[PDB]
Amino acid sequence: SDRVLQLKLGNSAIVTQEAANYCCAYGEWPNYLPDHEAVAIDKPTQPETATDRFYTLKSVKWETGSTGWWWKLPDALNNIGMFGQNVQHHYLYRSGFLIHVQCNATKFHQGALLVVAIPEHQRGAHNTNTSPGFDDIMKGEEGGTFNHPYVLDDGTSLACATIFPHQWINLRTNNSATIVLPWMNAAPMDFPLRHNQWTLAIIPVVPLGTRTTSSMVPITVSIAPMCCEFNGLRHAIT
Amino acid sequence: SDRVLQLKLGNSAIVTQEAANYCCAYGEWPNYLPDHEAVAIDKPTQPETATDRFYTLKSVKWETGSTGWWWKLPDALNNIGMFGQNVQHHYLYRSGFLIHVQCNATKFHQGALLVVAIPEHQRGAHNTNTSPGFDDIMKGEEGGTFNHPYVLDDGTSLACATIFPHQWINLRTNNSATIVLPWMNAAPMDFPLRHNQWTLAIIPVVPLGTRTTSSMVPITVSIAPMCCEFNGLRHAIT
Amino acid sequence: SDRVLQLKLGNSAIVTQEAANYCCAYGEWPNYLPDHEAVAIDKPTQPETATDRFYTLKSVKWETGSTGWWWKLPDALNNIGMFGQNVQHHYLYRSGFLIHVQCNATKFHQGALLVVAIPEHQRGAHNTNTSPGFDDIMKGEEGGTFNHPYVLDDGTSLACATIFPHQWINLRTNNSATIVLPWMNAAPMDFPLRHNQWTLAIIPVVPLGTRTTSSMVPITVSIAPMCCEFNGLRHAIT
Amino acid sequence: INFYKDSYAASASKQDFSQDPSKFTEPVVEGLKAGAPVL
Amino acid sequence: INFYKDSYAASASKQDFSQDPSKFTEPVVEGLKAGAPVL
Amino acid sequence: SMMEINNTESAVGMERLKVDISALTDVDQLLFNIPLDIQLDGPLRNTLVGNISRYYTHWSGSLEMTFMFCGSFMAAGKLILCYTPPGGSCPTTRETAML
Amino acid sequence: IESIIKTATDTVKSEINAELGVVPSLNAVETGATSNTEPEEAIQTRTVINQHGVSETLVENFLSRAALVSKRSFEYKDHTSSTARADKNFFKWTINTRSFVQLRRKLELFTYLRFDAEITILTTVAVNGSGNNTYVGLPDLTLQAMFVPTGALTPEKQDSFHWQSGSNASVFFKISDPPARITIPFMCINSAYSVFYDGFAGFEKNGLYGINPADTIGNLCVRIVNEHQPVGFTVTVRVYMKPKHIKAWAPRPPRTLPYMSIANANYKGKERAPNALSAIIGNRDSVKTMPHNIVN
Amino acid sequence: NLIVPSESSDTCSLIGFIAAKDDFSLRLMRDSPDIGQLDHLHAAEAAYQ
Ligand SMILES: Cc1cc(-c2noc(C(F)(F)F)n2)ccc1OCCCc1cc(C(=O)N(C)C)no1
């Protein structure tokens, strides 16, 4: 009853038979911007199924020495499908996200992945006074990897990352994690090309292990924007 | 009361002070596809202000020997703004159009332009048995020119073109023409890259003339899609 | 309905067929001094039609290099008709004004005049620490010309002069401007020979231009005092 | 807190929210209507 | 004691005892019941 | 209040308060652009809105630009005025600005 | 029409418009009226409930701020061998609001102003180092500020019998105290001060131009009450004025060129733009040049 | 295009105006950078004479 789940958005659907539950960040659900909170006065465009659908990013391989992976939103989706086109043609965007992380192995495999959505994951640089550059932060669809997951690449602690909305993929228990993210920002809308509201981090707290014949064990991320709206139409910028 | 007009769609607006009236093709107004006429069962996307707005094409010069100009829809708009992106990312589209043609001169100038929207303007070739090719028909935003406007480039008559929705731009009378086009098709929706429902033709029945110092006299076309909807989302094709 | 106007005061009348509207300074109309605001206790004289009538000043020529013109009130009218006599024979005066500025040309002419009534237009001198002298300020019926209209001859901006009651004479649009001025003073009455409540400024923001055969293009000012009253009768001083 | 006997000694008055911008934005005898041509 | 005209000048507000720890301890769509297995 | 659109070395005095337009022999040509920054020294600085606003640090709300054509009665023409929300470069072609 | 406005106006959502005879985006600037085009008529809008306050732009708030109006330094010492132009332990100041540009420009945004004036006097002292470049400490002196109205006699020396102030309002304050403060009422003989006065102050032709005699205030006379010490000090007095209970009329174009004098509006402008006589706004290469164009 | 007859001026001028709508608001008063002084204005000293 809580291990099987189907998510359907637009023309996309996902089914998992080894879920635990799914997390609604801070007990909230995505919604459109209400009139009593709006700032931009132009009529927003709400593409609905054109943008509110699952986009699957490139899979990554879970290796023995893997330190972890991250993707910044909306940066990771800014060049994908109609969501990317709307982002490129509009000065302002707003949306939640539905995140589904997939990783399966055998009953002889072991490992634990922490799947956490970090709001405003401002990254720090290691052993230097220079702030991270644009190329260090904006990785797009490919995402990045943690240099020091122990401190979340920001001088904090991985052990306390559970304060953020998160699930675990414990191979003996489940093969997928689902997190629903509301709009998380100090402003009602934002410029999607210069600010990232959420960071999805997947960190192998317990390394992948087995004594059976080894196989590639990928981790796959599917993200569906929810309640997308865009304001300030102009020419494409990207 | 009938010479001044303002058209506002999305983030675009047009004002003319020398209009005659405006024509609603066959006395109809654009609308969305009703449930009792729909065929495609997927939820359509309706971008609204993102696509239902005025797009201005490249102006053309009205010369003494000008034979006339034409633009095919939706071909002319298939690579412009969010309308173009939605067309490229969807197998099916449906929309009306709001056409505004602009041409101004002095009170010492004379000339008459017929502005007619031809439904299913299937073109013929002159003095050959070979049918027109793809490059002859699909001209995109630049449009084309009439080889033999006298017969509408199709073996018919220009004199009888008034059976189609049309206005005139008579320089001594008005400097703009406005035509509202409903969806005109045998099918509820269509593939926008292979079929053109409407052809806009501007033909100088009375040539431009004056004895005052000559100036460039452009003709400018602005077209706003109305009640756009798209079905069959996939990757961009263009 | 708003382009034709007739003004009738006393034995004078003015008709224009190319007006835009007329401006009532700060949305006010002239009136006599009420009892609850009076200071001087002697019975005032109210000549009515003898003074509340249109006086036409000397016309000025609009040239290519014209910088603009100004007239100070009541100084400009202080020696004209019965208004001048009453001013000369009384220590105190009070009145509004009705200003009508006239300038006509052909449909081949272009130009724009800003017609603004400046309250307390205290003039400054250019490139000197010495304040303007009596002869620089008190020009009478002939008025003066702007040395630096760009800064209104007072170190301020011409661009912001629209904060004052004003109209425009745009040659393609209208050939006259009308402004109704109420009494504008810190005191209920004033000595007319030493203080000017209003300054009428006509500044050619867009120079006169044409390619047709040139003609003299005058600008004519007609000013009618309204609700005149005078106190403190004595011998003529002028 | 004003214990002074003269009223002009009081603190500032920041509660006058009355406005009439038409005195400067529309000082015309004939009011203009929305949409209708001015001229 | 606040005689200032601007409300943000007031002293601190230490009387908001409202809590909702479930926002961080139980942010799951399906609430869990006591004793019953979670999975 | 009037903008100083023509803030160029060639313009003196009130010449800076008007923009001249002439007949062109090419279509869809750009005529002028207006920087929208009130804090920087631009065409909007010496206006009522600009002068008053520069006594403050934060601002919000819509602005309106009004243009008066001061040609002869016999002159005719059509122009397109575009506002581009920020994010990219100022458009240099009509087909981009009209979006 | 007059109305009570506390927040910026809300926006109402709007639909497509195609109506013959209706052109809300067209206007007639020639009438002198500002364009009445609404955002809902120019573009398609959404509904927005605007909660933005407008209180900080109230005229009272805009002008009711303490601003420097007078700053005078004088030597506190034995003035037996001082020149006639030297301030000998006291000074007098003909009150005006035109000496410091920040307050002057804000005041000159209006033609007429009516307000009461809160006056704050701030005093600082420093030991004289000329020759006697030795520090012994700062004395806590007593000062007297006397308001001398029009027609009253001003003191001519630090120990003048005019300081007895039989009817003049005087305030005695110490340097160690918080700055002295008093409220001066609206004292104009008219209903409002004339910020600008296009007239002459006298019945002859040699009177001063641009200063309304109705607004004449008087003189502020400040002395050190203490007799001089064996060593000399430099005393600096700063006077701040804050208008309150303000009424304002007829706003004016702001001052652009630098001020030249406190007696007139004479202008010269900077040598080059910005704020030059021939170019107020800084130059750009052409009307098609975007000064701060964003590239990538 | 701009089209004029031979007798009209071939160059025409536009005047651009700007204003805020009644949804405009401002906050955080500050000293305007549009005015400043580096010395006392002329005749300011005379007030103390
Ligand atoms: C600065 C000052 C100081 C004192 C004073 N100092 O000490 C004392 C004493 F003796 F009681 F202790 N009185 C008195 C009055 C003062 O100024 C009055 C400001 C009024 C005004 C008019 C205008 C104007 O002309 N406008 C706006 C066009 N502006 O402001």
UniProtKB/TrEMBL annotation, chains D, E:
It comes from the Viruses. It is found in: Host cytoplasmic vesicle membrane; Host nucleus; Virion. Protein 3CD: Involved in the viral replication complex and viral polypeptide maturation. It exhibits protease activity with a specificity and catalytic efficiency that is different from protease 3C. Protein 3CD lacks polymerase activity. Protein 3CD binds to the 5'UTR of the viral genome. Interacts with capsid protein VP1 and capsid protein VP3 in the mature capsid. Belongs to the picornaviruses polyprotein family. This is Genome polyprotein. The lineage of its organism: Viruses, Riboviria, Orthornavirae, Pisuviricota, Pisoniviricetes.
Automatic annotation (TrEMBL), chain G:
It is found in: Host cytoplasmic vesicle membrane; Host nucleus; Virion. Belongs to the picornaviruses polyprotein family. Protein 3CD: Involved in the viral replication complex and viral polypeptide maturation. It exhibits protease activity with a specificity and catalytic efficiency that is different from protease 3C. Protein 3CD lacks polymerase activity. Protein 3CD binds to the 5'UTR of the viral genome. Interacts with capsid protein VP1 and capsid protein VP3 in the mature capsid. Interacts with protein 3CD. This is Genome polyprotein. The lineage of its organism: Viruses, Riboviria, Orthornavirae, Pisuviricota, Pisoniviricetes. The chain holds residues 565 to 860 of 2188 of the full protein.
Automatic annotation (TrEMBL), chain H:
It comes from the Viruses. Signal peptide: none annotated. It is found in: Host cytoplasmic vesicle membrane; Host nucleus; Virion. Transmembrane segments: none annotated. Belongs to the picornaviruses polyprotein family. Protein 3CD: Involved in the viral replication complex and viral polypeptide maturation. It exhibits protease activity with a specificity and catalytic efficiency that is different from protease 3C. Protein 3CD lacks polymerase activity. Protein 3CD binds to the 5'UTR of the viral genome. RNA-directed RNA polymerase: Replicates the viral genomic RNA on the surface of intracellular membranes. May form linear arrays of subunits that propagate along a strong head-to-tail interaction called interface-I. Covalently attaches UMP to a tyrosine of VPg, which is used to prime RNA synthesis. The positive stranded RNA genome is first replicated at virus induced membranous vesicles, creating a dsRNA genomic replication form. This dsRNA is then used as template to synthesize positive stranded RNA genomes. ss(+)RNA genomes are either translated, replicated or encapsidated. Interacts with capsid protein VP1 and capsid protein VP3 in the mature capsid. Interacts with protein 3CD. This is Genome polyprotein. It comes from Human enterovirus D68 (EV68).
